[PDB]
Design a protein around this ligand. Structure first.
Ligand SMILES: [Cl-]
Ligand SMILES: [Mg+2]
Length: 357
């Protein structure tokens, strides 16, 4: 029998996803990071155990995205501390043992001010890092998916710099594929431009080349931003040259007729641009702030609608951004320590979508 799946078949099998957020991804200059646990716990989550990482499966999830920030464990030439790599591998091994997919990435390394935000002039360091990650996991089967980076924005003037992005994503593909083994054919998730739907689906976006034809595209679904990611208690502002401060109005509800038409239009854009061309779409983060004044029925309806579209559209999936508890982050859905969901109806909706009902 065939022992390979196409890119679309792989994302279809990946089912529903969930992120292990605000854990291996943490960073902050204020913390002197000397050991893995120093980074892992610095935002308020505990050191995760096997049960904390894989129990999500019983709620209908088949993919764990494992966001990892690497810079504090890289020496001056980009070599990754062996203990850090071992701790990353341990979590990957838990996910794989549970029969789930793992998406492993390079996360806050690309934030403005961190090294990967510099663009193509750090390609050498990016290749050094991915060579090490790729070699560490080269033998892993196709339930391990590697994601080039997270949310990077490169510009030249006020135009988006798709060339710099492509230089980096192509270096990622070439480096991973070049190591051979199962890296020759595993699904690779390619970052969109700032994971932005509009920019990634624009005519300027430049997908990298892959002889294996085993690439997916990464877009993050925080649309509309005023509902999903804008604080209600501390709204976003802008200030003019004379000191007048303007509030950008946050939204607390979602679900009007035009809201649904906007979501459908977004999926259609992604379908025509990527899935219809054989490139599946991993919506590697979706979420809504949970510690603000967002209407709880609207949070539930938004996630239900979005995951339902990801289930209805061939070659798509959604991956929930979740920080576990409100002393550790701002989007809290499943408390991995207590095995309890904050909203039982959010939980039930995931179970039902996963089951096809
Ligand atoms: Cl003025
Ligand atoms: Mg599907």
């Amino acid at each position: 029998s065939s022992l390979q799946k196409t890119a679309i078949e792989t994302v279809n099998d990946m089912g529903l996803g969930w992120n292990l957020g605000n854990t291996f991804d943490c960073f902050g200059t204020w913390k002197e990071i000397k050991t893995p646990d120093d980074q892992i716990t610095m935002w308020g989550n505990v050191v995760p155990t096997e049960e904390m990482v894989v129990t999500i499966k019983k709620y209908g999830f088949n993919t764990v995205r494992f966001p990892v920030t690497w810079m504090n464990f890289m020496d001056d030439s980009g070599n990754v501390n062996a203990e850090w790599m071992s701790r990353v591998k341990e979590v990957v091994d838990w996910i794989i043992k549970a029969g789930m997919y793992c998406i492993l990435n390079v996360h806050h390394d690309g934030v403005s001010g961190n090294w990967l935000s510099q663009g193509a002039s750090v390609k050498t360091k990016f290749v050094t890092l991915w060579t090490q990650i790729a070699n560490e996991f080269k033998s892993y089967d196709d339930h391990l998916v590697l994601e080039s980076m997270n949310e990077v924005e490169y510009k030249t003037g006020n135009d988006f710099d798709f060339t710099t992005l492509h230089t980096l994503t192509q270096a990622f593909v070439d480096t991973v594929r070049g190591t051979g083994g199962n890296n020759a054919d595993r699904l690779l998730l390619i970052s969109g431009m700032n994971t932005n739907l509009e920019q990634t689906c624009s005519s300027g976006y430049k997908m990298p080349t892959d002889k294996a034809d085993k690439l997916a595209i990464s877009i993050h679904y925080y649309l509309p931003p005023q509902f999903t990611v804008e604080s209600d208690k501390n709204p976003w502002t802008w200030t003019d040259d004379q000191g007048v401060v303007h509030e950008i109005t946050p939204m607390q509800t979602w679900g009007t007729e035009s809201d649904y038409k906007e979501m459908v239009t977004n999926y259609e854009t992604m379908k025509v641009t990527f899935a219809d061309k054989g490139i599946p779409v991993i919506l590697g983060e979706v979420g809504v702030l949970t510690e603000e004044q967002k209407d709880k029925d609207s949070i539930r309806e938004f996630l239900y609608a979005q995951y339902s579209f990801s289930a209805a559209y061939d070659g798509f999936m959604s991956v929930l951004w979740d920080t576990s508890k409100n002393t550790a982050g701002d989007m809290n859905f499943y408390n991995r320590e207590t095995d309890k969901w904050y909203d039982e109806k959010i939980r039930d909706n995931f179970v039902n979508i996963a089951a096809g009902v």
